[PDB]
Amino acid sequence: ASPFRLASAGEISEVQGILRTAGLLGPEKRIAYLGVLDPARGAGSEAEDRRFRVFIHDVSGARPQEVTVSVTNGTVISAVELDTAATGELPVLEEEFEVVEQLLATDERWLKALAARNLDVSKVRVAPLSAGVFEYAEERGRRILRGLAFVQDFPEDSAWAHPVDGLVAYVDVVSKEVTRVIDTGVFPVPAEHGNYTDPELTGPLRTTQKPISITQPEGPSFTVTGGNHIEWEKWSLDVGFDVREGVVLHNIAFRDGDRLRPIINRASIAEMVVPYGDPSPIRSWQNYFDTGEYLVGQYANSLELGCDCLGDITYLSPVISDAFGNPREIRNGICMHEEDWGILAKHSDLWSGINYTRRNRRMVISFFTTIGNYDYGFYWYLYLDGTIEFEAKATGVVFTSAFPEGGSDNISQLAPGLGAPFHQHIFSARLDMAIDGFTNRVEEEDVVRQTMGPGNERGNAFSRKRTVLTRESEAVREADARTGRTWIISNPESKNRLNEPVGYKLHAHNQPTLLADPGSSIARRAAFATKDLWVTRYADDERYPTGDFVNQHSGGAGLPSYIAQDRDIDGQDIVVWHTFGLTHFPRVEDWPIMPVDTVGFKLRPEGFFDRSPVLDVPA
Amino acid sequence: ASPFRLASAGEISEVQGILRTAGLLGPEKRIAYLGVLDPARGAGSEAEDRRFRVFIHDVSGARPQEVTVSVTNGTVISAVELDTAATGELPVLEEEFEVVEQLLATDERWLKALAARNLDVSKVRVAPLSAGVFEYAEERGRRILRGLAFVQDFPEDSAWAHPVDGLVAYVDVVSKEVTRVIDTGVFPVPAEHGNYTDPELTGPLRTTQKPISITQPEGPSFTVTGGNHIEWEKWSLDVGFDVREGVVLHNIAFRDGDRLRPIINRASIAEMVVPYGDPSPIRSWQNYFDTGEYLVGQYANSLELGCDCLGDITYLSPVISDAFGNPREIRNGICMHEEDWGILAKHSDLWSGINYTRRNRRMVISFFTTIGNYDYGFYWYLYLDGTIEFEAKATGVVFTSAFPEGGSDNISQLAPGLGAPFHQHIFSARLDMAIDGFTNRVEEEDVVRQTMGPGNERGNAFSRKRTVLTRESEAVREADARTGRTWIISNPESKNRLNEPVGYKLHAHNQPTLLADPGSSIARRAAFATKDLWVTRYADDERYPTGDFVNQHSGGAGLPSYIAQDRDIDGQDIVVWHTFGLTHFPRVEDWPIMPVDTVGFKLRPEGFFDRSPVLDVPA
Ligand SMILES: [Cu+2]
Ligand SMILES: [Cu+2]
Ligand code: NA
Ligand code: NA
Structure with missing residues (x-):
């Protein structure tokens, strides 16, 4: 059954064959991208139709092609030749x-x-x-x-x-x-x-760390069925994997009583860019779209027990295509585990005499990728109380340069004569929302301060305001940390028991967005990175904030083009695109290999439930 | 010797005896506050003088007294009668x-x-x-x-x-x-x-949660000597406890090679205020200073193993005075443990062929208190890489009211007829800094955007600027999340191997500060809460941002009075006061008992070390 199942080696072999039998995969063709397409809206009514999308490079200078194949029926759906000057070059091989x-x-x-x-x-x-x-x-x-x-x-x-x-x-x-x-x-x-493994540099290794053992004597509290369907502590989802995006979560839903209530239809990191802030002509062109240009999924690490993922770990080993269409397993490429998360709720009541403590936990779905000098961990978390969270962990080795004599306004010194140019790492999370189903809207919520006077004689009152984003032209939003700005995704046709629309609130970290001058090439090409929050109307071909072909593409596609359609988003099938990033002025401590730093975001239920959803957690 | 050791039962009884002997503690007297004072600046070859400070209330209506006792010498150092209408009432008994x-x-x-x-x-x-x-x-x-x-x-x-x-x-x-x-x-x-323990409301309790077992078969990697001295993974510190502030960290230092390098002399939560935002006369006066009015330490919970603190836990059981000067132990009041903290550093290198992964850990020192409906956990973290973090965990039962017919701009609905007025929980962290010793200064660091043009032809350059805070008059600072503002505490006389002053950078969460009108009583009484960052010159009597006596005390004391002295803070013994808080618009999910929410801050090394301090961590 499972239409959201991971691609199998067989399907990839069959795409290669179908492409062969059909004449498109010669000995001079190279696959730059291959991945399964998600089902269409309302496709569960009719039979399974597994389609794969493929970008094909030609080593003999011929024009590249974009091809859709049906593996279910053994057919080709379309094949178009690309003008790359127009729509962009294919991802780096x-x-x-x-x-x-x-x-x-x-x-x-x-x-x-x-x-x-x-x-x-x-x-x-x-x-x-x-x-x-x-x-x-x-x-x-x-x-x-x-x-x-x-x-x-x-x-x-x-x-x-x-x-x-x-x-x-x-x-x-x-x-x-x-x-x-x-x-x-x-x-x-x-x-x-x-x-960093040379004893001369490390000195004698520490002998002071005593072991920490994390075990589960009855196994984990989550189940995996159909290869990639997870059920854990009322949550239900499917774990996908794409060579561009990496880990993708599908059909995030929560079992509230006897109803499976959708929350997010699709969650992914749809782009990430690393723009450099050194005006030297040696590096001033430098902007790495690790997702769009390099494809972070393809470089996912094989994770090792005890080292990368600690505890009782269930692994998925996603299969991708090599350059010739042969399937290749990324062994132990995705970790799945639950872990303790401290206190969930606690009260000791003087009047009732009741003392009450409950423990929290979270489900973790992660992978780690390596692009050249950089290494990134992508972690999705589901919490008992209905919170959903993403965290990126950045490590690796910092990208270096000379350190100028007389210093630099745009480069840090790491060691004698060694510099690290200033840069950012900026992510775009694409959250195809489905709060209690697909009829959703977003409101910007700010805290509202109140002036002392009539109706507020003591000058203590404060409040909030919510502004519905009604059309895409109104849906490009910025952070305002000072006024506690958040965004609420609700379903105006689904009300909780207090007659208020059900909702989830997105809490951003409010880190700086893209710093480059607005007239720069990178501001045009990574326009998504200039603003914190975007809302579009869902369309099947609007997958990435930077467009399908990022490599050597001028502006012309992605979010600014999508937003230009000015579509109704007030009680419709919508998609939230959240920009969040780290601005890195490297420090001596980052050298010679960098300690993890993090950034992320979370969404919390906001009148989604009729009371706390964790009253039934046992002591 | 250990002059920073926890107060013992014997010392408290001795303070009682000294006060009795001096005629200061007859049958109408009650102890409202008692705490050991920190050793004086200097003090090494000088032998121990353990001094205690005591606030004494009189139930017959006589004026209260503030008294300092030398328990070592059996003497009253000072005893002064308080005019409470001027200087403030004693804390609530x-x-x-x-x-x-x-x-x-x-x-x-x-x-x-x-x-x-x-x-x-x-x-x-x-x-x-x-x-x-x-x-x-x-x-x-x-x-x-x-x-x-x-x-x-x-x-x-x-x-x-x-x-x-x-x-x-x-x-x-x-x-x-x-x-x-x-x-x-x-x-x-x-x-x-x-x-929330009634089966009719919880429904059948979950049977889906399988065990997570966290153990240390060789015991923990930290040691405790002298009752409260912790050594762990190059860190050194003393864990104090005060009935007002709760857990206080003293002498936080890091052993870098052969040298014990101070970082923070004293760290505490020196005040926390919970202002309500409902203009009703029934609650418009409501502002709870849990620390200054109620004394959070005194209500610290006894923490049960496997319930409140999980893993291999070492407890401290601090001793406080009761109302009569008799010692009272808080059994298992402070938890100490180390825990795994995921990946520390990781790189898989294409050119060298070396793959490298290391795990992180943190030391955790925590307590949990209960003030009426509210329960707060105070957590301090030390990380392998030199990072220091604080987190508050807020839970309990929300403070309720009626929900007005026709709604409210200042109250949320939780259940039929039941409201929860809007409020904030705002903390002040007092960090008496000692970056490589006491000669310190603070810089405000902002990201600096650059205009495309000569010297920046592609419009990619970005930079930063640092502004030294030279005197107290210029040291009252606000957040700017948009510009990535942080504050760096450095030692201008201690350079790293690259000839740069050693420092630590404070990273705030940039949550809203006090929302009340600036003309309100609470804006004057909790003036500290109106700004994110304050820096003062160290003085032994400048302990709390709200002064010594907060209960029913107007403005006139605390940080605004301290800052008026306009003292030099540019390479002097300084104290950082960071305001950070949660703004709480209660949600239905908060009822009938609230899931934990968090807020905090961290400080990370910023050219303090000569390279990564975790190269000697083993695989
Ligand atoms: Cu970086
Ligand atoms: Cu609250
Ligand atoms: Na949607
Ligand atoms: Na200091």
């Missing part, structure tokens, strides 16, 4: 990661730059970095990667410790040409190593 | 809690009000509520409590379900007189029970 270095190695300008700095070409690593769109007309319609160099002194050395500043290369990865080499002058290559 | 109901039960006016509502006086509980300072001139110099009524249908009933609105009384608890009874008219007394 894993096989292109090595190509920037290989091409530069025999390029005379590059070799000249390395010789001036007395660097052995055999020891120079080149990061394959997304190009974006700037002043270079030659790049339009061409598939470009840019290259920044880092020295690896030996095979096990951390090359990030040795950035080669003042040097950047542009490369065409289809034609296999080097379009430009820019050498603005030599900077000293930082000499200290950053090898 | 536990013995006064019952007095409000007792006196009202035989008052003709109160009895008439109850008879008008067909309520049996035997069933009417009266909350003993702090009075504040309003328009009632006869209250000046008198110890007053105000009384709000709640019906208890039977001994084990939750009275909070049955508020008696439209009625309030004021009582002189020393003369035992009812000064006023105000009845503005009958409201229906809400009829539904709120008995």
